[PDB]
Amino acid sequence: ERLAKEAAQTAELEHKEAMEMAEKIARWEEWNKRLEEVKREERELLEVQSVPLRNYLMTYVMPTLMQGLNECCKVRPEDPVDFLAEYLFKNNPEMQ
């Protein structure tokens, strides 16, 4: 009977190890998923890095920047910088 209880002890210990393995594998799979999010960010970095500065600024910033500048001019504010910065903070949350 003692030997049978020893076998139960080791069986449950090894089932604990199987649980810990299943957790470790789930952790590793989530770790690979996270890494794939990181490699997505890597691809985005490569995409931006591809673009020489003139073109990168022109495409990404200038249309939005031009539009906001136009609206700031229509404001003729006491400070363009403050208005434009706030305007961008409001717009870009929607505007891409």
Partner: peptide
């Protein structure tokens, strides 16, 4: 990592496309 010298159509650059339109009207 992948690398390109992307060819740009004038329509893609607002500045160039503006210059194009201005020149077009000037010629016309």
């Amino acid at each position: 990592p992948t690398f390109d010298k992307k060819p740009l159509v004038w329509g893609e650059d607002l500045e160039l496309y503006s210059k194009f339109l201005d020149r077009k009207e000037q010629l016309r």
